[PDB]
């Protein structure tokens, strides 16, 4: 959840409920999935140490985040450019994401 | 990075396909396959090159060496229509590859 539509360079904060495990066995990833279908990763944290790396497309914009108490995992995007419009998806991580988000549509226009 | 071939891949019920990736350095056997289907989350098939993961029917198989991960479906069945998608997970950050489209060739 977070999503919606917001004007460009704008801010949002995007966030994830993980639920059925034990949250902090598992990095959890930001994909998005823009509307002609491509994938792009976004981000990786590590919530137990609270470590996060970036492509150049979103570094210095995006900050990924989150609470291993309240098993929460959080994007904050900033200064939201056209591009960043697609579908946002978290994902548990462990040599992959095989859960788990449903999506969460973020429009810039 | 990745690079799949093909885009689109047309094929009969029954029928075998093959879709392949190749990445820029090696990358050890770490990549992953994701099927989407239409309206749909992605979800895993198999990680580490060719490790099913579990719900997965073996009509999926995963092989490759080096740069160049194949995913086979031996008997093309009418659920896996959508898009297919490789990942790796050599290097962060994971790149996924842009994705072939199968197509269900009907009458």
């Known amino acids: 959840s977070g999503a919606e539509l917001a004007k460009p360079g704008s801010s949002v904060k995007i966030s994830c409920k993980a639920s059925?495990?034990?949250?902090?066995?598992?990095?959890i990833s930001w994909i998005k999935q823009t509307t002609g279908q491509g994938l792009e990763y976004v981000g990786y944290?590590?919530?137990?140490?609270?470590?996060?790396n970036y492509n150049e497309k979103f570094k210095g914009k995006a900050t990924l985040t989150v609470d291993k108490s309240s098993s929460t995992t959080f994007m904050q995007l900033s200064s939201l450019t056209p591009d960043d419009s697609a579908v946002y998806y978290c994902?548990?991580?462990?040599?992959?994401?095989?859960?788990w988000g449903p999506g969460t549509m973020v429009t810039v226009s | 990075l990745m690079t799949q071939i093909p885009p689109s891949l047309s094929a009969s019920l029954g029928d075998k396909v093959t879709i392949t990736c190749q990445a820029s350095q090696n990358i050890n056997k770490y990549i992953a396959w994701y099927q989407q289907k239409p309206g749909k989350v992605p979800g895993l098939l198999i990680h580490?090159?060719?490790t099913l993961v579990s719900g997965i029917p073996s009509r999926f198989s995963g092989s490759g060496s080096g740069r160049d991960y194949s995913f086979s479906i031996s008997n093309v069945e009418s659920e896996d229509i959508a898009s297919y998608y490789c990942?790796?997970?050599?290097?962060?950050?994971?790149?996924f590859g842009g994705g072939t489209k199968l197509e269900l060739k009907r009458a």
């Open positions: 994902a548990r991580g462990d040599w992959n994401f095989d859960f």
């Open positions: 580490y090159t060719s």
């Open positions: 990942l790796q997970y050599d290097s962060s950050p994971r790149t």
């Open positions: 059925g495990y034990t949250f902090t066995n598992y990095y």
């Open positions: 944290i590590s919530t137990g140490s609270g470590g996060t």
